Amino acid sequence: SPFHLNDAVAIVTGAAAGIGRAIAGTFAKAGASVVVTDLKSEGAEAVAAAIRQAGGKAIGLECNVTDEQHREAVIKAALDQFGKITVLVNNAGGGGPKPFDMPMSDFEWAFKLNLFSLFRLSQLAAPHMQKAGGGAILNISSMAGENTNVRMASYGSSKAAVNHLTRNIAFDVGPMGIRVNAIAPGAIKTDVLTPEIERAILKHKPLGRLGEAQDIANAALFLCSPAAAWISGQVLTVSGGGVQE
Amino acid sequence: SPFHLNDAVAIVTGAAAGIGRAIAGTFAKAGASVVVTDLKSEGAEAVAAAIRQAGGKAIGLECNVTDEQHREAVIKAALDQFGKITVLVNNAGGGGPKPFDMPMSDFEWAFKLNLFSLFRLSQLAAPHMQKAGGGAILNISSMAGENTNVRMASYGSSKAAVNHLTRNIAFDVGPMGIRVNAIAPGAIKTDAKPLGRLGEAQDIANAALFLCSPAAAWISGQVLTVSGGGVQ
Numbered sequence: 001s002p003f004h005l006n007d008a009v010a011i012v013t014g015a016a017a018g019i020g021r022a023i024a025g026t027f028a029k030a031g032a033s034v035v036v037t038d039l040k041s042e043g044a045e046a047v048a049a050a051i052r053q054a055g056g057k058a059i060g061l062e063c064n065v066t067d068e069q070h071r072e073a074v075i076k077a078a079l080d081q082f083g084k085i086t087v088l089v090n091n092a093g094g095g096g097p098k099p100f101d102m103p104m105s106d107f108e109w110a111f112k113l114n115l116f117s118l119f120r121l122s123q124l125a126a127p128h129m130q131k132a133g134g135g136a137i138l139n140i141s142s143m144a145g146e147n148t149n150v151r152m153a154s155y156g157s158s159k160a161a162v163n164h165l166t167r168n169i170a171f172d173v174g175p176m177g178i179r180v181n182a183i184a185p186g187a188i189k190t191d192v193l194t195p196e197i198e199r200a201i202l203k204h205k206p207l208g209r210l211g212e213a214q215d216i217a218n219a220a221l222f223l224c225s226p227a228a229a230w231i232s233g234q235v236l237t238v239s240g241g242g243v244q245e
Numbered sequence: 246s247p248f249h250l251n252d253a254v255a256i257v258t259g260a261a262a263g264i265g266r267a268i269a270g271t272f273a274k275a276g277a278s279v280v281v282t283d284l285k286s287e288g289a290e291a292v293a294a295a296i297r298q299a300g301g302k303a304i305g306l307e308c309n310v311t312d313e314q315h316r317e318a319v320i321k322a323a324l325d326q327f328g329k330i331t332v333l334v335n336n337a338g339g340g341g342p343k344p345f346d347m348p349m350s351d352f353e354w355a356f357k358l359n360l361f362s363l364f365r366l367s368q369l370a371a372p373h374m375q376k377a378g379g380g381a382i383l384n385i386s387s388m389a390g391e392n393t394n395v396r397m398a399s400y401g402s403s404k405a406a407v408n409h410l411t412r413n414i415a416f417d418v419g420p421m422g423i424r425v426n427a428i429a430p431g432a433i434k435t436d437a438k439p440l441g442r443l444g445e446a447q448d449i450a451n452a453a454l455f456l457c458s459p460a461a462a463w464i465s466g467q468v469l470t471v472s473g474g475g476v477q
Contacts, residue, residue: 068349100417101368104313104361111356111406119398120349145409148466150416153364160409161356161402164390168397172345233393 002227005032008135009082010224011074011125012036013065014092016043018190019140022213023089023220024048028056030221032087035078037063057082065092065117075124085128086135087224090118093140095158097151110154115161122180126173134177136224139166140216141182141235163235170233179232181223185216186239206241247460250277254327255457256319256370257281258310259337261288263435264385267446268334268453269293273301275454277332280323282308284337302327310337310362320369330373331380332457335363338385340403342396355399360406364414367425371418379422381457384411385449386427388472404429408468415466424465426456431472438474 005027012024016038024034028051036051036058038044044060051058059081063070078085095110122137129135144152145159166182173180187201188211202208219238222228250272257269261283269281273296281296283289286307293305304326308315323330340355367382374380389397390404411427418425433444452471455461470476 100371100414104365107364108361111360115356115402116349116353119352123346126345148409148412148416150413152413153410153417156413157360157406157410161406164393164405165398165402167393168401169345171393171395172398 003030003221003225005030005087005221005225008032008086008224009078009084010034010087010089011078011085012089012091013063013121014038015047016040019185019188019213019216020089020091021047022217023091024058025051025054026214026217026221027087027089027224028058029054030225033057033082035074035081036060037065037074037092039064065121066112068120071117071121071124075128079128084132085125086132087138088121088125088129088135089138089140089220089224090121091140092117093142095155098154099151100153102154107154110158111161114158115165118162119165122169122173126176126178129178130176136228137173137178137180138220138224139180139182141166141184143184143186143237143239145184145235146237166235167233174232179228181228181231181233182235183216183219183223184235184237184239186211186237187243188213188216204244206244209240211238211240247462248275248455248458250275250332250454250458253277253331253457254323254329255279255332255334256323256330257334257336258308258319258366259283260292261285263437264430264433264446264449265334265336266292267450268336269303270296270299271447271450271454272332272334272457273303274299275458278327279303280319280326281305282319282337284309308337310366311357313365316362316366316369320373324373329377330370331377333366333370333374333380333382334385334453334457335366335383336385337362340400343399344396345398347399352399355403356406359403360410363407364410367414371421371423374423375421380424381461382418382423382425383453383456384425384427385453386411386429386468388429388431388470388476390429390468391470392477411468412466419465424461426461426464426466427468428452428456429468429470429472431470432475440473444471444473
């Protein structure tokens, strides 16, 4: 069964909660040694200790993925703690709806947070992955990278930048033995509202349920595992079929 | 015929040469008063003077599109000279192949030059386009926005951001009366199959004129590739 992460060392950012937490928890149970990072070191430490209590190996650290010193701290700590890096999951990000006339600083921040951070972290992890014999990068993008709506100027174009970054740099890092893929999560219910709101949403979901975080982490495990050794440069949309418009 | 630009006042950036020069001249002969800008003020002026000499209405200015003072001045200049803004052609841009391990400034700069500049120029022009009753924004993107290859981390993803910017801000400025479209040029005979000749800047200018004319009053959020069919 190739859906394992035996002997892997995986960095998973923004993983105090939600999708990143599920990813780190699933990656440890699949055999990876997980370096959990978050804006708050407390949240990343809770997850890492849940992993250790459950029988895996993990450390949590504070990391602001937009500050270059923190990024190098995470790389050094992972290598100090586990001797190598072979898997990088860029789950950290943010943004959302903003009017067309937003401040430039708002627009530019969607890119510092959603794009430049993961790109530099891929730059930083890549040489260690290659020295390690190979590895896998995963970008948690978003469906706004593909969809077209009002109030999406910064959030949507930054996520499209991420999707296409994914496609293109799989060419550059392939010969280092690295694959690069992305997941575009859909409507995931995070640990929300009334049973009448959900029932009406679920009239427009083909599978008639929202997602869970474990749905995305299952797809993350898939794409970073040897079971996806021939998959690189793909954006994989995990959204239960979409939404009837 | 709706394939004209009478009643239009068109800002055209990076237009001292190549595709942008072709767009500026073509917009003028189709009847638009053109505000030509370029990084080099003299190149902008040369184009404007030739337009006027050929019977059009235009002026030329220096504009480094990444400079908020320069952007503001270009808006001010279209209003002072021609009284209105209806068309914005974001052709200024740059970049190209770069190693994956490029300095972070090269990666970031391709976004300030290719993306943040136009978006800000779009914010500036939009109130005047609404006030004038409507208008058209046209972004000159690149085939690298949808293609994939080595050495394209910065250039390709910034052009992808331009593409999807175009698709989404069509929603925001539609209610203002503004349409937004992009062109990806391809296989063009930069002075730098279906014919017995390569692409020409004029081919791109003809597409740009269509996408900015009343003949495209019902086209918004599209990315039109103009490359002779070569794609993927």
